[PDB]
Design a protein around this ligand. Sequence first.
Ligand SMILES: [Zn+2]
Ligand SMILES: [Zn+2]
Ligand SMILES: [Zn+2]
Ligand SMILES: [Zn+2]
Ligand SMILES: [Zn+2]
Ligand SMILES: [Zn+2]
Ligand SMILES: [Zn+2]
Ligand SMILES: [Zn+2]
Ligand SMILES: [Zn+2]
Ligand SMILES: [Zn+2]
Ligand SMILES: [Zn+2]
Ligand SMILES: [Zn+2]
Lengths: 148, 146, 148, 150
Amino acid sequence: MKRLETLESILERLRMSIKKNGLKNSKQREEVVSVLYRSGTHLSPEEITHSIRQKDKNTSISSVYRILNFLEKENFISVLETSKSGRRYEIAAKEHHDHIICLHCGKIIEFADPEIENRQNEVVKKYQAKLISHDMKMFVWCKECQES
Amino acid sequence: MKRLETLESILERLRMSIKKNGNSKQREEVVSVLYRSGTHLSPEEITHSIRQKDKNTSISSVYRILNFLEKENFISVLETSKSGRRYEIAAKEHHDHIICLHCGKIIEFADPEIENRQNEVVKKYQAKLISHDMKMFVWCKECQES
Amino acid sequence: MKRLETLESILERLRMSIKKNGLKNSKQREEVVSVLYRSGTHLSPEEITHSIRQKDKNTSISSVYRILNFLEKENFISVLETSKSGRRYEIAAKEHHDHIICLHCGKIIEFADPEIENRQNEVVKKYQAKLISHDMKMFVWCKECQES
Amino acid sequence: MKRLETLESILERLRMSIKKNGLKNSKQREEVVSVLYRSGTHLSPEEITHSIRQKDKNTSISSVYRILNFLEKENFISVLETSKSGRRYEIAAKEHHDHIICLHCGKIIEFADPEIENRQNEVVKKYQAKLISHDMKMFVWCKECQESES
Ligand SMILES: [Zn+2]
Ligand SMILES: [Zn+2]
Ligand SMILES: [Zn+2]
Ligand SMILES: [Zn+2]
Ligand SMILES: [Zn+2]
Ligand SMILES: [Zn+2]
Ligand SMILES: [Zn+2]
Ligand SMILES: [Zn+2]
Ligand SMILES: [Zn+2]
Ligand SMILES: [Zn+2]
Ligand SMILES: [Zn+2]
Ligand SMILES: [Zn+2]
């Protein structure tokens, strides 16, 4: 895996933010962040709650949302909207990429296409604008869901 | 002021839907407001327009309408942190959006080469492209000028 | 009072956001927004909680923290750091102002001095930078804590 | 690199503060101070760790945070916090200044404007209050980020 920051560094920043805000449940906040860091992959709140529940039965999805919102707000993690509410999360410390999203099964495929990246800048420059960031997702039926 | 469809045709279809699903007038007015508009409108502005003819209309009733219309594909939503939620008539040719991070200005575009390349890219995964959503966030020409 | 947005509009946006975040449907959460909106001061969570407990006597200050943290992330309210630990909150839909904060009593005085606002721009111009926003706090001993 | 005090003087005050607090001298803690003293910018804990690891590779960032927390609470260093730049640190032995921060590239520009400083005094005088301290940050698009690439 390629990450833009170390987990240790992320944890120290998290711990500082936690102390700063006087937040409780340091243990689970750290767990959620570590699960995403190690996965690289895009997980649903349900899959995250499932993941950390294995260690502590006290875990509720409501608590996880408070965690994911905290983590999202502090830019520790990134959120992907897959539906009207369907959402998935990944560690924020990854190289830029866009998303192919299978409507059927939910599979996420990362991509970064040089031609699209370049053309986007070209379009914007036609307006003498400066490209800061972009949000681009393609919704598909994946090859496996088509064979199904 | 182009559309893929006349307002009357859209309203025909609308009057169909409000029966299949179970204030047909106010729905039609909201659609009409958006159809006549050349911009993407917030719930607040839509409400304001409606209030001109129907004073004391609550924004909450407009939201309920917008949610139904969006659900049934009569209108589409553009949502960013900077600009909030804005709506437009669905009966327009496909386009994507540029949004200024500073002033919130929205610029519409549709680049044949980008659309083509998106199709080439998905073929690499032997997936079938159903739809996409593309937003570019920028500093616009006017915001950059001293 | 002067508000840049109606309470009903804010509440509709909140409800939209509740759904999108896939969160609970909360009266107390709308209650907190309402208290801050209607108030002409900057409130502590203790003050907000005292307001909330008029109806729900069992209300914990922890539930209030949880609400505040969500509203601030969604930009419905603004947080002012009065101390390393001290937090105060206000509705986001108010015209720009900066803060005078008494170190001894905690009194908050809003101000917007046209000269200060202009000088800030003049300063950034010296560096050929464009001013986007600013955060200015002045900590003082108010006239009443002085005389007393 | 205008400093209010020699590095050596600061490190001796540090030694005295360490003994007073019942702590143990460490070269690493002195190295954090020295890195910051030597720096012409504002450094993140990560960057400080990078520098320290040039001499001791197996240094942990948790140890640097602990050091930073002590140094800052005892006023050997100052911290600047923004969402955009996160927490960044500098040696405390510098003339008073406020901060400009670029929202795009995170660059920090220091400034000290006598007229602004005087105007703040005038303003609090309007309320018959006594100014004690202030925190002033301006967020900008800096000159370099505004440059067109076309
Ligand atoms: Zn991209
Ligand atoms: Zn699939
Ligand atoms: Zn991703
Ligand atoms: Zn497109
Ligand atoms: Zn603009
Ligand atoms: Zn549009
Ligand atoms: Zn101001
Ligand atoms: Zn006072
Ligand atoms: Zn205020
Ligand atoms: Zn100053
Ligand atoms: Zn910059
Ligand atoms: Zn500084």
